[PDB]
Amino acid sequence: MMDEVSKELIKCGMRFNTEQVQGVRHMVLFKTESGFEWGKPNIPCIVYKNCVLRTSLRHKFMITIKDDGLRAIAQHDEDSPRFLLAHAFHT
Amino acid sequence: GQQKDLAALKLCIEVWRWCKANSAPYRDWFQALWFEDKTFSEWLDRFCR
Amino acid sequence: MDKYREIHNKLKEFSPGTLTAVECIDYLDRLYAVRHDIVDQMIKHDWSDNKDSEEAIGKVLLFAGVPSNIITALEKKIIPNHPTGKSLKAFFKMTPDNYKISGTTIEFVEVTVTADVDKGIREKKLKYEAGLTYIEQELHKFFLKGEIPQPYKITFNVVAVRTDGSNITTQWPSRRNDGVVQYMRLVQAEISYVREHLIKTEERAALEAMFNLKFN
Amino acid sequence: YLIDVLKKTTAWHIGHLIRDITESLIAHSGLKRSKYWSLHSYNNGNVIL
Amino acid sequence: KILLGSLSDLPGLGYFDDLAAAQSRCVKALDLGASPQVAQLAVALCTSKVERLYGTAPGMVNHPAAYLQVKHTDTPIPLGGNGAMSIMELATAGIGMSDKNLLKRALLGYSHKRQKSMLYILGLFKFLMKLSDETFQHERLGQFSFIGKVQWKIFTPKSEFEFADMYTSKFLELWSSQHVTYDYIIPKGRDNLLIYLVRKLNDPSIVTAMTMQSPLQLRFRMQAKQHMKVCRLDGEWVTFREVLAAANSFAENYSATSQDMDLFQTLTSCTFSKEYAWKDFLNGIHCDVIPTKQVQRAKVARTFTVREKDQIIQNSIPAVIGYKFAVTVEEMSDVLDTAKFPDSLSVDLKTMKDGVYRELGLDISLPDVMKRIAPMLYKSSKSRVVIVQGNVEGTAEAICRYWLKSMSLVKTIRVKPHKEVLQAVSIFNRKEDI
Amino acid sequence: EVLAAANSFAENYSATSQDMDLFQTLTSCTFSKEYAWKDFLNGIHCDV
Amino acid sequence: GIVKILEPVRLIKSWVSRGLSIEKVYSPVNIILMSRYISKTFNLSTKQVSLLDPYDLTELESIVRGWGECVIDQFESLDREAQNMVVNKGICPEDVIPDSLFSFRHTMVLLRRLFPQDSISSFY
Amino acid sequence: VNIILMSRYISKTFNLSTKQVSLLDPYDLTELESIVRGWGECVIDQFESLDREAQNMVVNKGICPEDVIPDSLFSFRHTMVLLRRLFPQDSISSFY
Amino acid sequence: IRDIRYQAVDAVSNVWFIHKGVKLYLNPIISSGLLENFMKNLPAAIPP
Amino acid sequence: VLATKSSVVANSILSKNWEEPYFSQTRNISLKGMSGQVQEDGHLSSSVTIIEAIRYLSNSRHNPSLLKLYEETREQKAMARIVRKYQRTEADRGFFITTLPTRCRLEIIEDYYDAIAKNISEEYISYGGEKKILAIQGALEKALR
Amino acid sequence: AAYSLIMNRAKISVDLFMFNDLLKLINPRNTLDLSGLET
């Protein structure tokens, strides 16, 4: 989701606001060596501003199989946009 | 190791004392009775040695 | 039959002394079921009656032209000689192993395979013949009162075959004794095998207790 | 509010004295000791049993 | 009623048993509605009475400190012990939990650094276990939990009961050793049931209960007050001082063993029944006074259960244990009759063995191993009814919290860790986790 | 980078029975002579 | 210290009691399988049982205790069942357990010690 | 000597000229080769003296063919069950 | 002398006792762990 | 009221387990007092439940069930006595002790009636321990309404 | 040996051939019928 939003912002002409701080008293979105996590970082790292974790924000599909069964693309109906449902190319 | 030897010696003392109180085959019994991993005859030989 | 083949396939891959008591019990139950089925099949082909699915006594009488109204009326009656006082409705619910209708005569036969022929025979008699004879008297009274043009004749024959099939020809002088006794000899070996081989030595007492409770 | 208040009461010491008397009487209640005389005293010789 | 009946009656089964009875019935009085402070006062009074009767208190002959090189608090309860525990631990944890805590602390001390004062406690516990393994094995089954205890004399003739003198004591001991499955299940056939009942009749606890209101009980009290031969050290009747001296002699020359360490950990480790960790709950709890006037609500009775049964085992633990130990056909028939799910007995036994092997290096396949470890692993599932005031939920945590809020007679008490801090844990709990 | 990775590993470290056993074995048996010398040095009084 | 025994027969008779018998689960077919195995492989009509060692005789009696109590009363039917099991399918002559107390190795080594046999026949 | 003794035992007890080894399961052939590895290298070069020594040891005093250990990586149970499964034998003969 | 382990005694060969012409086999007693019971004239229980 | 709960009443009555052995249950081998047999002097003997159970087991040849025990001792006359020493047990409540056949008959009646009564315990009979307050609370609510 | 077993798996090892020779020396006509290749 961070990659998608970063691509959208790049297409729109702006970039993420990043601040290097040694600690935040509140819950902020911070990036570590292992990835992106939510919480209170007590380690000097990169914290992305304008990120709010809203917990209050919380069917038939058809799947097309490619790469002999390594990636999956699904959509709601025939006219729905295609999105990569699943893929095994992880680490 | 000393404790095991002490226990074997005490067992031999008791069995011989009873065998003398009664009428028993001392030598035959000492070749039949077994303690831990050593027979009574071997225990007596070790005590002698 | 194919059930014996499946059982043999399942049991040739089990090393001796590696079956839990409950597994031995249910395998034995399957084997007794297979033996009962093969004896049912020999009688099936002997009588040439292709009644693959067992039918209830009421259904058998329906195949004999007995009207349903008199059966429904009799369903309310109670057997006076029943050891447990079971109703006629439940006695009609149960399905005998085989049946045959020849005019006004209907033959019911119950078959069991056991070493104690007399015990099985008397058990099947006390289970079947009381209700069968009560139905016989009921239909005789109905015929006397005039609700049926011809009286019905009922016959019950129980035959028990020993585990070795020595007296199977004496009770059933059939042409097909040899193949059936050969097949039944095999089931004994299989039963005895798992019973005294694939079973675990630490659970032999458990097997004995479960066998005693289930079958004795 | 209970033990501190009742500690200075006369009933506390009376009960302790009765307890000692009962202990002596129970001690005398034995089969051997029952048929013999006895004598005891408590509280600086004030109470005699 | 229970508070005042806690005093006159003397069980006469020894220091540990009398103390346990007094504490248990004080806990029962607390359950019926007694304030924790009144229960604590009653516990102190009964402990003082039993200590004076047995001479355990410091100041007279039977004090353990005069015969053991260990602190009075650190001495095991069966010996001269300090039964002045808090009513909270008695009601929540148990009666013999002091010995369990002492053994846990001793094993913790033995690690890290290898001292002698803690190996002394280990030797005392081993001596207690050696004394315990000289009587009926079913005594440890049921009743109060203990690692080991000193047996005391029974000062009443066996001829008072008509059928006690039908089977000899050696007969009963050898029958119990041969038929261990009957320690966990009740025999059905008369041949075994008659022997079971005769063994039950000669039980010292049952004998005392049958002679509880008789003049014969004064004999034991007078023997104990006069410090006569009342205990056992080997096949001879000995005085309590002799038991203390023998315990000191055995503990001063005791060498730790890997198997002994494993068995001590078995005692210290988790239980076959889901038990709440009351020790760390009480250690980590905090209570705060809230300035609110006391409100007297009604009274409702709730079922306070402390020991549950694991749902994975479809049969009761006694049934599975007896089925494993049963070797005779009639024992198997009895255990099948008692068990509600006979077909799953083998599966339950296999899961039991797998869990024991997972949590412990001990293998229950050997009859001796399971025979020794079963009483220390399986404990009873007795249920209790506790009178509570208001909206206390029918859970052990809620009853304990209500007891914590009830410590103050006038001031309202609030418990800071208001979240669910339950610790329902068993041997197979860790298995399900992994 | 090594220091950062060490911090990341250690912040989320969970106690393990095997690891605790290994550390106990080390500090009680393996390094016994070293700690004996340390205690020797600590428990000595020198007057001038 | 010093103890003397004058009535040992009565001393032992005082210990006599019933009900403390260690019964074992017998397999009626397996018992006769091992009986046939022993009869075929070993010649038991060579050495008299009278001159045999009582120490080994006690063990032999203990391991053979209660074997026929389930097969002597019913012999022909059990023999027929065993024949059916052994002919209809192959059965290992070693994996079969007559009763829970039975120990294979010990039984064979005791039998060979009591009834020595020429190893050349087994080898050559 | 134990190698030649166990080889002879296997030769007499089991009939190895019945099933073609080419059609045998490779999984079981691997285990058989593992348990028989190196036996030839110790007995083919010198056989007659070894055979005479084996006779001498087995004829004078009894040898139980379940304690013979041909090498330090031998298990009687596993080898015999493998050979039973590879080469079936009519169990009826053993009991009849 | 105390602390005598009669249960640890094992019987290897035949053990025989003679008393007024009566021959007794003590090997089952040794195997049953009842050596002390017969040692000091103490009660015990044995199968018939 | 009972006719609408026939199935549950039948299940409760059948769940009393009338077929189990009489003396295998805890309640029949407890320490509760029980009258013994008539002695030579003509006075009934004060005894205990476990002792009487042992006596019957010794005299009998099998462990009978509740129904079998009642049938065997049907002709036996009921006898009763007042305890020698009062209470003597935490589970001893009352002042009278009866004989074994009397205990068996009272147990039969008590078990049958407990089975037939536990089902209507939600409205009429206040069963203590778990649901004692519910029936009385419902009655009081109806009264206040 | 592991490399030879992995690569070919269709040619018996020299150990099996040596065992066959040993069996031939002990008692011929009871040897394994060998038709595969070596190594």
Author numbering:
A (entry chain D): 1766 to 1823, 1830 to 1862
B (entry chain C): 1621 to 1669
C (entry chain D): 1 to 216
D (entry chain D): 462 to 510
E (entry chain D): 1187 to 1620
F (entry chain C): 1428 to 1475
G (entry chain C): 2028 to 2151
H (entry chain D): 2056 to 2151
Sentences from the paper on this structure:
Hantaan virus is a dangerous human pathogen whose segmented negative-stranded RNA genome is replicated and transcribed by a virally-encoded multi-functional polymerase. It catalyzes two fundamental steps of the viral cycle: replication that results in the duplication of the viral genome, and transcription that generates viral messenger RNA (mRNA). The interior of the core adopts a right-hand organization that is common to all RNA-dependent RNA polymerases (RdRp) and comprises a palm, a finger, and a thumb domains. The active site cavity is located in the core center at the intersection of four tunnels: the RNA template entry, the nucleotide entry, the template exit, and the product exit tunnels.
(iii) The structure of an apo HTNV-L WT hexamer, determined at a resolution ranging from 3 to 9 Å (overall resolution 3.6 Å), reveals a peculiar configuration of polymerases into a trimer of dimers with a twofold C2 symmetry that had never been reported for any RNA-dependent RNA polymerase described so far. The central dimer acts as an anchor on which two external dimers bind symmetrically. While the central dimer displays a unique configuration, the two external dimers adopt the same conformation as the isolated dimer. The symmetric dimer A can be compared with the symmetric dimer generated by the interaction of protomers in conformation B. This second type of stable dimer constitutes the central dimer of the hexamer. In dimer B, each protomer buries about 2700 Å2 of solvent-accessible surface at the dimer’s interface, which is less than the one in dimer A, but still significant. In both cases, the CTER domains remain the main hub of the protomer interactions, that notably involve the swapping of C-terminal residues 2142–2151 into the CTER hydrophobic groove of the second protomer. However, some protomer-protomer interactions are specific to dimer B. For instance, the CTER α-helix residues 2131–2141 and the CTER loop 2118–2121 of one protomer B interacts with their symmetrical equivalent. Analysis of the interface area between protomers confirms that the hexamer is indeed composed of a trimer of dimers as dimer B and both dimers A display large protomer interfaces, respectively around 3900 Å2 and 2500 Å2, whereas the other protomer-protomer interfaces found in the hexamer are smaller, comprised between 350 to 1351 Å2. In addition, HTNV-L hexamers cannot be further elongated since the relative orientation of dimer A C2 axis and dimer B C2 axis is not compatible with the binding of other dimers.
